From Swiss-Prot:
Domain FERM per the UniProt entry, residue ranges: 4-284
Protein's UniProt name: Band 4.1-like protein 3
Role according to the record: Tumor suppressor that inhibits cell proliferation and promotes apoptosis. Modulates the activity of protein arginine N-methyltransferases, including PRMT3 and PRMT5.
Primary location group: cytoplasm
Keywords per UniProt: Acetylation, Actin-binding, Apoptosis, Cell junction, Cell membrane, Cytoplasm, Cytoskeleton, Membrane, Phosphoprotein, Tumor suppressor
Tissue distribution: Expressed at high levels in brain, with lower levels in kidney, intestine, and testis. Detected in lung.
Residues of the whole record sequence present: 107 to 390 of 1087
One of the protein's GO biological processes: protein localization to juxtaparanode region of axon
Species this chain originates from: Homo sapiens
Keyword 4Fe-4S: no
The protein's assembly and partners: Interacts (via FERM domain) with CADM1. Interacts (via FERM domain) with PRMT3; the interaction is direct and inhibits the protein-arginine N-methyltransferase activity of PRMT3. Interacts with PRMT5. Interacts with PRMT6.
Signal peptide: none
Record keyword Cell membrane present: yes
Gene Ontology MF terms: actin binding; cytoskeletal protein-membrane anchor activity; structural constituent of cytoskeleton
Amino acid sequence: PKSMQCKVILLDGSEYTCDVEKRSRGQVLFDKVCEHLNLLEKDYFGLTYRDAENQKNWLDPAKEIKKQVRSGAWHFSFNVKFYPPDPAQLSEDITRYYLCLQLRDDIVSGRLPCSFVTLALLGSYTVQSELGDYDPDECGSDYISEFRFAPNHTKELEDKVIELHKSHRGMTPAEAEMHFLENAKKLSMYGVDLHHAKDSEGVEIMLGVCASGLLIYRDRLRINRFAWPKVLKISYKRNNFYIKIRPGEFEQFESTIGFKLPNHRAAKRLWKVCVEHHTFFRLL
Ligand SMILES: CN[C@H](C)c1sc(C)nc1C
């Protein structure tokens, strides 16, 4: 029975290696990575791989791994797939921990923009969780943390992390991680999966996929949102993505809104993440 080596980048930046039978479905690998991570609240997570166009795709747990990675390496990342709007409601501290590690990468990468003060506050909770109480012996006036807090670091930011870390004396790791999440969850781009697109006129927009629906970003002064319950049908055709909206009260007809994606694979990918968000946040 022939086995394929799998390499998975974990949220702490380390690498998990295992073997699965070459006909294995995605769920087999996911279950192995989740066991390794001691993670029981698996529904919020998944594995990503890079396609031949170097685009991130979600590994479908129901489909054969080989029919997704196709010509590419069996190389994956472990990631948050569904960002919970209220992380306090997760049943385990270890779930909140992985969510924090994902959000730290979202912030450092610039996927989750964040004010100076919120970067420093998030940083201060990370430092408290990982080192415990502020110690003046480890940090002089010239201290720079090993921790990555932001896409660009300044001495001012390092200073403010320390000033806020001082305030958290006595705080336990689960407590600091819960505070991290109570602040992170409020950021306007929290758990927003962004896709480049054009509207029906050819104007360049971003489409955001998240718990609260499909968001349209254009010019930063005109932001439309379609809550999931309003969306009856999501479809794609060639390079086009379509959402069918419920008729408003006393309106005779549903309305269908159309967008242009870079290519057919980009349209299908946006369709799949929308259907998955629609199902997940209908049930959560
Ligand atoms: C098992 N049911 C949960 C809510 C879902 S729905 C979806 C698209 N993925 C998951 C993990």
